[PDB]
Design an enzyme around this catalytic site. Sequence first.
Site, PDB file in Angstrom:
ATOM      1  N   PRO A 108       0.783  -1.215   0.000  1.00 46.67           N
ATOM      2  CA  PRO A 108       0.000   0.000   0.000  1.00 46.67           C
ATOM      3  C   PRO A 108       0.820   1.273   0.000  1.00 46.67           C
ATOM      4  O   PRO A 108       1.977   1.294   0.499  1.00 46.67           O
ATOM      5  CB  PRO A 108      -0.819  -0.088   1.295  1.00 46.67           C
ATOM      6  N   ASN A 109       0.211   2.301  -0.601  1.00 43.69           N
ATOM      7  CA  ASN A 109       0.722   3.661  -0.707  1.00 43.69           C
ATOM      8  C   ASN A 109       1.905   3.817  -1.642  1.00 43.69           C
ATOM      9  O   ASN A 109       2.299   4.940  -1.882  1.00 43.69           O
ATOM     10  CB  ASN A 109       1.069   4.240   0.662  1.00 43.69           C
TER      11      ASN A 109
ATOM     12  N   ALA B 129       3.758  -0.731   4.747  1.00 41.43           N
ATOM     13  CA  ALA B 129       3.235  -0.809   6.149  1.00 41.43           C
ATOM     14  C   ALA B 129       2.824  -2.196   6.644  1.00 41.43           C
ATOM     15  O   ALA B 129       2.869  -2.495   7.846  1.00 41.43           O
ATOM     16  CB  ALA B 129       2.042   0.128   6.314  1.00 41.43           C
TER      17      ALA B 129
ATOM     18  N   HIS C 182       4.747  -4.593   9.163  1.00 43.70           N
ATOM     19  CA  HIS C 182       4.681  -4.471  10.631  1.00 43.70           C
ATOM     20  C   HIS C 182       3.355  -5.007  11.203  1.00 43.70           C
ATOM     21  O   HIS C 182       3.239  -5.260  12.404  1.00 43.70           O
ATOM     22  CB  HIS C 182       4.896  -3.003  11.060  1.00 43.70           C
TER      23      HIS C 182
ATOM     24  N   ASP D 177       1.815 -15.788   6.288  1.00 47.67           N
ATOM     25  CA  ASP D 177       1.243 -17.128   6.121  1.00 47.67           C
ATOM     26  C   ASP D 177       0.916 -17.478   4.678  1.00 47.67           C
ATOM     27  O   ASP D 177       1.000 -18.643   4.305  1.00 47.67           O
ATOM     28  CB  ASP D 177      -0.007 -17.306   6.988  1.00 47.67           C
TER      29      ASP D 177
ATOM     30  N   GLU E 192      12.507  -9.337   0.874  1.00 44.93           N
ATOM     31  CA  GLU E 192      11.849  -8.099   1.317  1.00 44.93           C
ATOM     32  C   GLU E 192      12.709  -6.899   0.933  1.00 44.93           C
ATOM     33  O   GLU E 192      13.936  -6.894   1.194  1.00 44.93           O
ATOM     34  CB  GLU E 192      11.641  -8.094   2.829  1.00 44.93           C
TER      35      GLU E 192
ATOM     36  N   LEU F 286      12.376   0.988   0.277  1.00 41.69           N
ATOM     37  CA  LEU F 286      13.081   2.135  -0.278  1.00 41.69           C
ATOM     38  C   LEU F 286      13.830   2.906   0.828  1.00 41.69           C
ATOM     39  O   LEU F 286      15.001   3.262   0.651  1.00 41.69           O
ATOM     40  CB  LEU F 286      12.099   3.073  -0.959  1.00 41.69           C
ATOM     41  N   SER F 287      13.157   3.142   1.951  1.00 37.92           N
ATOM     42  CA  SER F 287      13.635   4.045   2.972  1.00 37.92           C
ATOM     43  C   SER F 287      14.289   3.231   4.033  1.00 37.92           C
ATOM     44  O   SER F 287      14.037   2.049   4.107  1.00 37.92           O
ATOM     45  CB  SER F 287      12.468   4.825   3.584  1.00 37.92           C
TER      46      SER F 287
ATOM     47  N   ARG G 256       8.317   0.684  13.604  1.00 42.38           N
ATOM     48  CA  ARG G 256       8.733   0.208  12.265  1.00 42.38           C
ATOM     49  C   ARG G 256       9.905  -0.799  12.236  1.00 42.38           C
ATOM     50  O   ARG G 256      10.184  -1.397  11.194  1.00 42.38           O
ATOM     51  CB  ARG G 256       9.048   1.398  11.373  1.00 42.38           C
TER      52      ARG G 256
END
Lengths: 147, 145, 145, 145, 145, 145, 145, 145, 145, 145, 145, 145
Positions: free
Chosen positions: H9-10, H77, H80, H87, H98, H101-102, H111
Site C-alpha cells: 500500500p501507498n 506498512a 509491521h 502465512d 523483502e 526504499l527508505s 517500524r
Amino acid sequence: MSSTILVIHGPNLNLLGKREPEVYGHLTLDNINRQLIAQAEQASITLDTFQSNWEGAIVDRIHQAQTEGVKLIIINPAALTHTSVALRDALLGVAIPFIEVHLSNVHAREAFRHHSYLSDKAIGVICGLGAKGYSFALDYAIEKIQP
Amino acid sequence: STILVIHGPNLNLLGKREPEVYGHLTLDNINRQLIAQAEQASITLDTFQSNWEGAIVDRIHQAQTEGVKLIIINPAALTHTSVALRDALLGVAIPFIEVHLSNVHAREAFRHHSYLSDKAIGVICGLGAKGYSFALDYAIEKIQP
Amino acid sequence: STILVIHGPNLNLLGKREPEVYGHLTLDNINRQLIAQAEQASITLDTFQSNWEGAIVDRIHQAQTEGVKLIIINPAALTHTSVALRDALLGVAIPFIEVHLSNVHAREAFRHHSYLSDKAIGVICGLGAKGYSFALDYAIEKIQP
Amino acid sequence: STILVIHGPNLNLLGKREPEVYGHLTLDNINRQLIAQAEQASITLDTFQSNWEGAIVDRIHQAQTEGVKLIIINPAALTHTSVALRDALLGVAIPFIEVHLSNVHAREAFRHHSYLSDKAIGVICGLGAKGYSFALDYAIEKIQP
Amino acid sequence: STILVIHGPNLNLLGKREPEVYGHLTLDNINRQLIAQAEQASITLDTFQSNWEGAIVDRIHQAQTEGVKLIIINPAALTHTSVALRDALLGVAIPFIEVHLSNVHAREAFRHHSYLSDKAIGVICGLGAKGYSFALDYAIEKIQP
Amino acid sequence: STILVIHGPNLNLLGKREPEVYGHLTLDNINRQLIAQAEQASITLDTFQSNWEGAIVDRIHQAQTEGVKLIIINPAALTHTSVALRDALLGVAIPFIEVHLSNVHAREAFRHHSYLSDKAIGVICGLGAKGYSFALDYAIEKIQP
Amino acid sequence: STILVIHGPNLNLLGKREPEVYGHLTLDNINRQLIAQAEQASITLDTFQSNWEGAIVDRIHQAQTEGVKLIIINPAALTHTSVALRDALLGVAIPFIEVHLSNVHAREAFRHHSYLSDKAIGVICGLGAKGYSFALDYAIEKIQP
Amino acid sequence: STILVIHGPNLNLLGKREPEVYGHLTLDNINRQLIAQAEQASITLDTFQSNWEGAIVDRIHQAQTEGVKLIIINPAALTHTSVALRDALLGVAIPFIEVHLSNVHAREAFRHHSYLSDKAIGVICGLGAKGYSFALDYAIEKIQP
Amino acid sequence: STILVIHGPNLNLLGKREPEVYGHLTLDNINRQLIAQAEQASITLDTFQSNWEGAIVDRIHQAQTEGVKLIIINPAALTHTSVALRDALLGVAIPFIEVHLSNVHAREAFRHHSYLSDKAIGVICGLGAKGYSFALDYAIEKIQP
Amino acid sequence: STILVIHGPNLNLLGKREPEVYGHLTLDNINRQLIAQAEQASITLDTFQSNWEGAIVDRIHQAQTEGVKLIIINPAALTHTSVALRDALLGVAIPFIEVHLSNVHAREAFRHHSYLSDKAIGVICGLGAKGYSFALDYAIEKIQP
Amino acid sequence: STILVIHGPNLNLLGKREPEVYGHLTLDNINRQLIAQAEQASITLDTFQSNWEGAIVDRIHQAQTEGVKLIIINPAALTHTSVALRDALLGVAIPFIEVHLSNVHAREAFRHHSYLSDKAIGVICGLGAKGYSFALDYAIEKIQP
Amino acid sequence: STILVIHGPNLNLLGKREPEVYGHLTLDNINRQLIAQAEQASITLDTFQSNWEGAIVDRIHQAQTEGVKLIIINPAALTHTSVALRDALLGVAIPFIEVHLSNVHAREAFRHHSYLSDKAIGVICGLGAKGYSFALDYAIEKIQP
C-alpha cells in the site's frame, strides 16, 4: 455561591500568551475564560473558573464544588494528568462527572504524556484543538444539562 | 544578571538528625557559601526552598518577571515525580542545571528516572555541597565572560 | 509520648459523599475513637488531615521537633506517587504504620505499587476504620510494653 | 469535496441491533446532520464508510485528487492496527482530526495505543455523535478566513 | 459460627532456630493467643498448618462442609505461587483475611505479588503475631456485630 | 598523591572536524588545563586516552601499582556497554568520578543506562570541559583539604 | 436455526501444498462433512472463506440479518491482528466458537495473543478438522437442547 | 512468469505530491527498469501493486499456480502488521526477498518490528529504487548459474 | 581510499570452517571480487578486518584523514553490542552502508537489535557475498553519477 | 489401561455448592459419561483426581508402567504454575490433550500462560464437560483409526 | 547425617525408558556412587527423592534436627517455582549446592529464572551425574579441610 | 594442546589486592593446579588470560588450528557483554565449559544474563578455584573415557 458548570485549569496555564507572543499565540487564560463565560451566559447557564499551580488548591476547589451544586466539571489538568492520583480520587470522591481538555495534542509529544490518571474516568476527552476544545466541552455540557 | 537557587522538599532538614552520622552541613551553610561566591564575582544571587510543589512553581514564574537568566535547582524528590516542575522551567525558558548532593544513580531504581535531567544544560550529582558551587561557577562564566 | 495520625488527601470526604457508597464513619468519628483509645492508655495523640502534599511534609518535620515516637499514616492517593512524603518520613527517622480503609490490591493495577510500604513497619489495608485502632493498638504496645 | 468524513469498520452497525440498547441514532442520521451543518456554512462535505482497510486507503488517495482540505476520521478499530492508514494520511498530507463515539481510555488496554493520534491536529473521544460536529466546527473555522 | 486459621509452609519453624534471629514466638504461641480471644467471645476456632499445598487445599474444602464463616490465612510462600489455593478459597466462597508476620514489601521484588491479596477482605503484614489477632478481632465483629 | 584522568573512545576527535561543530577545543587542551590546575595544588597528574577497552583496563590495574588515589573518568560510549571496566574499577578499589561533556540524558534512550554511575562518588554530565576541572577541584579537596 | 462457519485467510490452500503437509484434507471436504452433520439435526449451515478482512466483517454483519444463532470461526492469521473482527462479532452479539487446526501455542510467541479468544464461548485448537466438528456438535446442543 | 514483484500500500504515491521532497521517481518507472533488466536475462517478470491486503494474498496464491519461482516483495506498512501476508508466502512456499526504499530502522520504533523479515532470504532497506534491482540481480543468479 | 570496506570480528573464518556445510568462499575471495569491481569503475578501495573493537574504531578515525567518502561495514557481532563503533562513524561523519552475510532477523532475538542500523544509509542482510557488491555498486553511483 | 483422564485440584467441587451457580454436574457424572464412551470403542479408560500436585506426578509415572497411550488432562490451576507436571508428561513421553471447562482466556491475565499447552497435541477450553468428550473422541480416533 | 542429597520431582525416571536412547544411568546408581565417595571420606551421606514439594520441605526441616551440615540438592523443576523450598532452606540455614544434570540455560526461557540459585554456595549444571560428585567433593573439603 | 584454559579480564588481579579479602589465591596458583592435574592424565594443558576482547578472539581462532578438543573458559565480565566471544567459540566449533569463581547469580541483576551459558556443555559458578578442577576432570573423561 453556586454554579452549574465549573471550569478548572491546572498548573502553568496562567502563562498562556505571556512568553514571546510569537511562540504560543496571543491567547491568554483570561481570553479563554471570557469566551467561556460569554458562551455560558448566552445559554443562561451559571459558570465559574479556577486556576492554580498547587495540587491541593485544585483538590479543595473540587470538594467545594460538591457543596456549590456543580453538575459538570470541564478540566484541563495540564501536567497533573500524568501524575495526580489525588486529583482523580477527588473527582471520583465527589461524583461530579467531567470532561478532560488539552489545548495541545498530548499524543504528539513525549511518551510519558500518553498516560493519564483521569482519561479513563472522563465522559470524554478533547486534545489538540486549542481554545475551541473548552468551548466544545461547554457546548456538550449545556446539551447534557438543559437540552 | 540574577541567578536563582531553588532547593526542593526535605532539604531544610540538612544537619538536624545526627550531625555525627550524617554530616554537620546545613541548608544555610550552603546558601552562605554561594552568596559569598556570587558577591566575589559581582552577581546578584537569590535563593528559595519549600516542601510544596506549587510554591516552587510560583517561584519559577516570578523568576521570569524578575529577569533571572539561570536557575540552579536541586529538586530533591520532585526530580522523579513532577511534570509540573518541568513545564514551568520550559514555559518560562530560563536555562537550568540540576544538582543533587548524593549519588541518585546509587540508590533505589525509581531514583534513576528524572523529569528534569533531559532538559537541563547539565547535571551534577553525588559531590556534596561543592556541586552547587560548580553549577554557579558554570553559571558566572556563561553569564559574564 | 505522642503518636501522630495523618490522613492524606480526600479522606475528609469520608461519610459526606453517599452514605450508601461507604462505611458511615466520618473522619471526625475516626479521630474521636482514636483519641479515647490513647487516653485509656495515657498517651498523647495528635491528628492531621490535608489535601496538600507540602502541608503533610511540613507536619512530619514538626513531628520531629515535637518528639513524636510513631506516625500512623493513611496517605490515600499519595502512597502511589509521593516520593517527597517518603523522604520526609525517612529524613526525620520516625517509624510509621501505613493504613488504608479499602483493599488497594483489589482496585486498579496502579494502586499495587507504593513509595511508602517498603519502609513502613507494616501495612493494614481493607479492614475499614478499625485499621487505625489496630495500628494504634500496635503502637501503644511498642512504646510502653 | 472540501471536508471528507471517513468512518472505519462496524460504524454502519450504529442503531441496528436492539434499538433500546445503545440508542436509535444511525450512521445515516450522523451523516445527515453533518451535510446540513456544512450546507449552513456553504462548505461541501462528503462521507464514506467501509469495513475494508484497502477501500479506505483508496478513498484517501482520491481525496488528494478531489482537492480535500481536511479529513474528519473515526477509524474505529483500525486506530489500533493500521499503519497503512497512517501512511495514507501522511502520504497525501491532508491534515486530519480523529474522532471516537466512545471513550477508548475507559475500555480495555490495547485500545490506549493508536497509530494515528500523534499525527492528528487533535482528537475527540467519548462525546458520541457530537464529536463529529465539533470536528467539523473546527475545520470550518480553519478553512474559511 | 467457626473461624479457621490456616498457616502455610515453613511457619512451623517459628522461634525454633537461634531465638535471637526472628524472635521467641512459636506457631503454637500464636494459636494459644487466638483461641483465648475466640473463647472469650464464645466463638469456635480451629487451626491448621502444613508444608503441603494439598493438605491446605483439602482443609479449605472441609471448612465448607463444617460451616466455617471466615478464614484467616497466612499463606507464607504460597502467596507468590499457588493459584490452586486462590481457586479453593474462591470455590468454597468463604471470605478471608490474608496475614503475614513480616513486611513482604520490604523483602525481594518477587514477594510483592500475591495470588490472594486481590480477593481478600483485606491484608495485614509486618506487625508479627498481632496481625493475626487484629484479623480475628475484625472477624468476630463481622460475624457477631 | 596522583590523580589519573581517563578518556574513553572517540574523545581524541575533539575539535578535529570543522572548527564550527564542537568548538576549537581539543583533547590536548583539556589535559593541559587539567595538568596546570593540578600543578597549582602540588598534586601530580597523569592522563590517558584510548579507543581500546583493554588498554583502559590495563591502565586502571597499572594505577593500582602506582598508588593513584582517585580516578577522573569519561568512559564515553563504554559507560553503556562495558562491565569489564566497572569490574576493573571495583577490583582495584580506587574511587572515581564519572564525567561527560554532553548531557547523556538529552540523547537516545540507550544512553540513560550506565555500568559505572552507581559505583562512582558522583557524576557530572553536560557542563563541557569545566566538568573535568570540577571533578579535579573535588579530587584535590578530598585528597588534601 | 442457522449456524455460520467462517474460514479466514489462507485456509483455501489446505491440501494444496504437498500431498503431505497436513493431509489432503481440503476446505470443500471439511465443508461437506459439516453440511452432512448439520443436515442430520435439521440445522441450516452456511460456510464462508475469504482472504480479505473486510469480506469476513461484511459476512458477520449479514449473519445478524439472516437471524444466525451461532458462528463457528477459524480466523487463521486474523486472530493475532484483527480488532475489527472482534468488534464485528461483539457489535452483532452472536456468540461464537474459535477453532484452529494447529496448536497456536506450539509455534512462535506472536501466535499466543488473540483479539478473540476472551470473547468466545470457548476455543478448540490443535485437533485438526475434527475441531470444526466438535464445535458444531456443541452448537447443535446449545441451540436445540 | 518466473519472477513476481509485489508492491504494498501507498507505493502508488511515489513521486506525486511535491516533486521535490521525495524526488520525481514513480512506481511505473521502477517497474519499467525491472522489466527491462529481466528482459536482458530472458526471465519473465510480472508486477503488482494494491492498497488491499487481501488482493496481495490472492496474488501470492495465484503465484503458486503460475509456477513463480521467487517473489521480490515490498510490503510497505503491511510488514509491521500482517501475519496473513506471512502465512500466504509460507503456505505457497515460494522464497522471497523483502525490499524497502527508505531506511525502516531510522524511523519510529514500531517500524523496526516485522512479520516477514525472519522468513525472507534477505532484506534490502534504504537504497531506493536500486533495492529492487539488487534483489532481482540476486534472484536471476539463483535461477541461472 | 575513496571507499573503505571494514569487516568485524570472526569474519576471517569464512572458508576453513568445514567447507561442506557452510562452504568455500573466503574473506580473501570477497575482497578480490570487491577490489576488481572498484578498479572496473576506476574508483580506489581499501579493506580492513579485525577481531579487536579498538582497531576498527582506530581505522574509522584514519578514514576521516584519508578522505574516504563512504564506508561499507559488516560489523558482524559488534552491530549488537558496540556504541563506540556507532559514535566513531558519527564522529568522522562518513556516510555508511551496513552489510551482513546471513539473515540476522532469522536467528536469536538479541541479534535483532543494532547500534548502527538507524544511522546507516541502508542495510543489506541475508544475500551472502553479493550484499557487499550491491552496497559497492550503490556507493559508486552516489560518489560518481 | 489404554487412556487416562486426569483432573487437577478443585475439580472435586463441581456441583457441590449452589449447584445452580455452575451446574448439577459432578466430576462423577463426567467420568461416568467418559467410561461409557470409551467402552463403545473397546478402549479401557482409567480416571484420576487430586488436589496434591505430587499425587498427579506419581500417577503420570504409573501410566508409563501401565502402557497408557494418551492422557487427557484438565490441570485446572496447575496449568499456570507446575513445571514439574510439564516435566512429568515429557519424561514419560505420553501425548496429551489439555481440557478446561471454562474459557480461561476470559479471566484474569495470569491465566493466559500455561506450562502445558505448547506441548499438548491440542487444547479445548470453554465448552463445559463436552470438552472432555471431544478430547476422548479425538483420542479414540487416533489410537484405532 | 553430615551430608544430605535431595532429588526433586521426576528424577526417579532416570534410566527407565528405552535406556539405549535416553541413557542407562538411574537414580540408584547416582546414590550408590555418592555413598561410596562419602565412605572414602569418613562422612555420612543420606539421600532423598520425592515428587511431592511438601515431602521435600519436611525432609529439609528434619535435616536441621539431624544436624546436617551441608545439603546437595537437585530441585529439578521446582527450581523455577517453589518459594517454599527456598524459605525452607533459608529457615533451617543449612548451606547448599544446587545441581542439575542438564544445562538449563540451553532450554526454554523460563528455565533461566531460579528461586534458589542466588542463595546457593554455587551451582553446577549440565555435567550429568558427575555434577553431584563435584558438589560432594567441594562439600567434603568444606566440613573438614 | 587438546585442552585450553581461558581467563577473561580482571582475573589477573586475583589475590593481589589485600590478601585478607578473597584469599591469597593467584591466577598462577590456579593454573599450576590445573597443569599438574592434566600432567597426571597425559594431557597437555594450555592457559591464557587477557583484558582485551580481541586477544581472546584471536586466541580462540588459534586454538582451532592447534587441534584443541575442549575449552574451559571463565569469561568473567565478558559473559554479559560479548557476542563476538560467542561467535568465536561457535565459529571454531570447539566445545566449552563456562566457569566462574563467584556465584554470579547472587550479585546484580545484569549478571544473570550471559551470551555464553546457553552454548556451553555446562556451567559452574560459586565453587571458587575448584570449579576449574571440576571442569577439567569432566573434560578429561570426555576426551579419554
